[PDB]
From TrEMBL, chain A:
<keyword id="KW-0456">Lyase</keyword>
<dbReference type="InterPro" id="IPR015421">
    <property type="entry name" value="PyrdxlP-dep_Trfase_major"/>
</dbReference>
<dbReference type="GO" id="GO:0047804">
    <property type="term" value="F:cysteine-S-conjugate beta-lyase activity"/>
</dbReference>
<feature type="binding site">
    <location>
        <position position="168"/>
    </location>
    <ligand>
        <name>pyridoxal 5'-phosphate</name>
    </ligand>
</feature>
<protein>
    <recommendedName>
        <fullName>cysteine-S-conjugate beta-lyase</fullName>
        <ecNumber>4.4.1.13</ecNumber>
    </recommendedName>
</protein>
<feature type="binding site">
    <location>
        <position position="92"/>
    </location>
    <ligand>
        <name>pyridoxal 5'-phosphate</name>
    </ligand>
</feature>
<dbReference type="GO" id="GO:0008483">
    <property type="term" value="F:transaminase activity"/>
</dbReference>
<dbReference type="InterPro" id="IPR015422">
    <property type="entry name" value="PyrdxlP-dep_Trfase_small"/>
</dbReference>
<dbReference type="GO" id="GO:0030170">
    <property type="term" value="F:pyridoxal phosphate binding"/>
</dbReference>
<keyword id="KW-0808">Transferase</keyword>
<feature type="binding site">
    <location>
        <position position="91"/>
    </location>
    <ligand>
        <name>pyridoxal 5'-phosphate</name>
    </ligand>
</feature>
<feature type="binding site">
    <location>
        <position position="116"/>
    </location>
    <ligand>
        <name>pyridoxal 5'-phosphate</name>
    </ligand>
</feature>
<keyword id="KW-0663">Pyridoxal phosphate</keyword>
<feature type="domain" description="Aminotransferase class I/classII large">
    <location>
        <begin position="32"/>
        <end position="378"/>
    </location>
</feature>
<feature type="binding site">
    <location>
        <position position="199"/>
    </location>
    <ligand>
        <name>pyridoxal 5'-phosphate</name>
    </ligand>
</feature>
<dbReference type="InterPro" id="IPR015424">
    <property type="entry name" value="PyrdxlP-dep_Trfase"/>
</dbReference>
<keyword id="KW-0032">Aminotransferase</keyword>
Length: 382, 385
């Protein structure tokens, strides 16, 4: 597979490279999609959709379900059946549905901050009290203060825990013990646990993603799993993802809200791409991990040697959380300095929470040579 | 040159329409509203090139897409809108959900004209809203609104949203200016928000003209939004892009807020591409389509009126024909069962659209003339004089 060609996406109206369209020298290393050529079989499947299909309505076929079932079993040791699997155009839509189906207006929803901005956004826009349990940085990785976490849950009468696993940013691939503690807190306090495991295929460095409901047969009583092929295989634009809800009561609640919002449908290209990704993508994924790891090592080595930036080594995901505290330039001025001076665009760390004021996130799902150029630019400034 | 004579074989393409034919190829599917025609050439090429050339990541709504919609609205519907007025959403029914949620309070009554597109009623009921069904009359071969009753329905039930289907499906009613004005004036008078589902707006036939609601009166945008799409027009429903036109800033902001809250603000890139291609290139295909649909409709009228007791409502628009089987006294769903089991043709169960559809079935004629002819001959052989 080809992980060296950085596709020219400047004329493809991409979110990632939009601001580079009239400024080609500007490197984009922010939003989480990849600058690699597509998985060959996925590309082939989408082309064949164009070549062969009438572009009308389609149903979710058995092969698509089977692809997800097989993926979940083989890649994550999670045995699910067809009825457990709900397709939805995206994980964040699924989060909206979960908030709306599993809690009442005003109910507190907890997240671990800093985290993927759409978490906080979606909680706020849905009239929920947002509870941000601040993660601690200990020995270069995020850790949960479980004493505070339980306090946050009790003090705020938290009804839903929106979990990011692996956690973005930071790339924390929670240990089994972490996840068990989380789940036990939810069980103890009658909290519904929504596990956003969209990065579940991107555990690196010998780390193992533990899908929440695989840990204990009781967890499915209050836990739903959200994931997708889109982060793993760079097919976000195809708009298909899945929720796995083994608890029938929770599942029907989710389905009702999904139908109420008319989010029960997804584009056929998303059915096709997800199926192709899971059916054929494993070998590509394995090579991707190697490339991503190589890129991360480059970031750590160069930034740690030539710079005062503190690098949080991802345990997973292809996104690197960078601590620019030493330079005392807060966001958004920090990201502006990176874009304007370094000519590299990183995510504004403040978007993920107050904790990210002096942080930026670097997307290394792009060829090594591009990561190298980005690093040299950053170093030339910082 | 376009092709409206080849009926594509969709049996191995996991289609909603032909699902029950996949192991029963004899069964003709003439129900759900997508078309059995080859795709618009330029749309197919656009989608093929998405596959060949894009990285399948995130995309934004580009200016050519907005312009395509702006130009389409102007040229095809005399509706001048700007980029800021246009919100993309994966579908019209999703936009309806957002409209209900953003433009009314918990439990508020929502009105529809029955019988109508089933997802209207379903979406209203599932969103904790009272379903007020204003029953359409059938007068001189088309639906007409009883405005006396309509006003009563609005007042007596404190209706907060009027979900309008224009053109109306089923029946294919392309409302007269007078009708739309009376509707809008009632909403204006009674503080009702009007959601105009104009997804069939490009499919007015025979010289009938669709009148997009807000073109009628500059004040209507204060309480009226327009929902439409390229998908019904160009048979690209699977690409999941459509648009809401909301010129009123407040309505627009409320809609966008809820759209974002539901995370329905993004659509698949293939839908962006397909919609843009449809509006940029599809006009000539559309014009030929209309003549094919018109021909099919005339064939349905001629054959069914001559050889059966089925009363045919001639569509003013849409490619869907509302058929009255009252004379045979077989009610739905036994009616559609008889059609499927004996005539080997699948038509929509009229009752799904409302109580008034008890003895009705809807025939989709967006398929080659020879296929319509086959369906007609089958129907006639089971339902005679
Ligand atoms: C943690 C996390 N959740 C959700 C999303 C959104 O994914 P989607 O494209 O399915 O909405 C992203 C990607 C993400 O990083
Ligand atoms: C009247 C009407 N409204 C809405 C829709 C929904 O179409 P979609 O959800 O594919 O945009 C259809 C089809 C329709 O016939």
């Amino acid at each position: 597979y080809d992980f060296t060609t950085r596709p020219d996406r400047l004329n493809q109206f991409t979110y990632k490279w939009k601001t580079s369209e009239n400024n080609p020298e500007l490197l984009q290393m922010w939003v989480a999609d990849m600058d690699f050529l597509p998985v060959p079989e996925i590309k082939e499947a989408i082309i064949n959709y164009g070549r062969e299909h009438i572009f009308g309505y389609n149903y979710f076929n058995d092969d698509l379900y089977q692809a997800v079932i097989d993926w979940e079993r083989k890649e994550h040791d999670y045995a699910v059946v067809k009825e457990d699997i709900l397709f939805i155009d995206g994980v964040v839509p699924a989060i909206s549905i979960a908030l709306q189906a599993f809690s009442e207006k005003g109910d507190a929803v907890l997240i671990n901050s800093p985290v993927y901005y759409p978490f906080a956004r979606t909680i706020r826009l849905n009239d929920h009290r947002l509870v941000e349990n601040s993660l601690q940085i200990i020995n270069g990785r995020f850790e949960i203060d479980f004493e505070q976490l339980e306090k946050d849950i009790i003090d705020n009468n938290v009804k839903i825990y929106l979990l990011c696993s692996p956690h973005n940013p930071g790339g924390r691939v929670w240990d089994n013990d972490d996840l068990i503690k989380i789940a036990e807190l939810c069980k103890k306090h009658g909290v519904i646990l929504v596990s956003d495991e969209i990065h579940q295929d991107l555990a690196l460095f010998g780390n193992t993603h533990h899908s929440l409901n695989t840990l204990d047969a009781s967890y499915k009583d209050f836990t739903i799993i959200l994931s997708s092929a889109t982060k793993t295989f760079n097919i976000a634009g195809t708009k298909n993802s899945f929720a796995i809800i083994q608890n029938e009561s929770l599942r029907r609640k989710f389905q009702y809200r999904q139908l109420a919002n008319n989010q029960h449908e997804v584009p056929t290209v998303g059915m096709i791409a997800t199926q192709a990704a899971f059916q054929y993508g494993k070998p590509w994924l394995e090579e991707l991990k190697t490339v991503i790891e190589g890129n991360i090592k480059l970031v750590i080595k160069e930034l740690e040697a030539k710079t005062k930036i503190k690098v949080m080594e991802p345990e997973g995901t292809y996104l690197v959380w960078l601590d620019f505290s030493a330079y005392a330039i807060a966001q958004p001025q920090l990201s502006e300095k990176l874009q304007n001076e370094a000519k590299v665009v990183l995510n504004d760390g403040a978007h993920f929470g107050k904790e990210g004021k002096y942080f930026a996130r670097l997307n290394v799902a792009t060829p090594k040579n591009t990561v190298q150029e980005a690093l040299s630019r950053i170093i030339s400034v910082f």
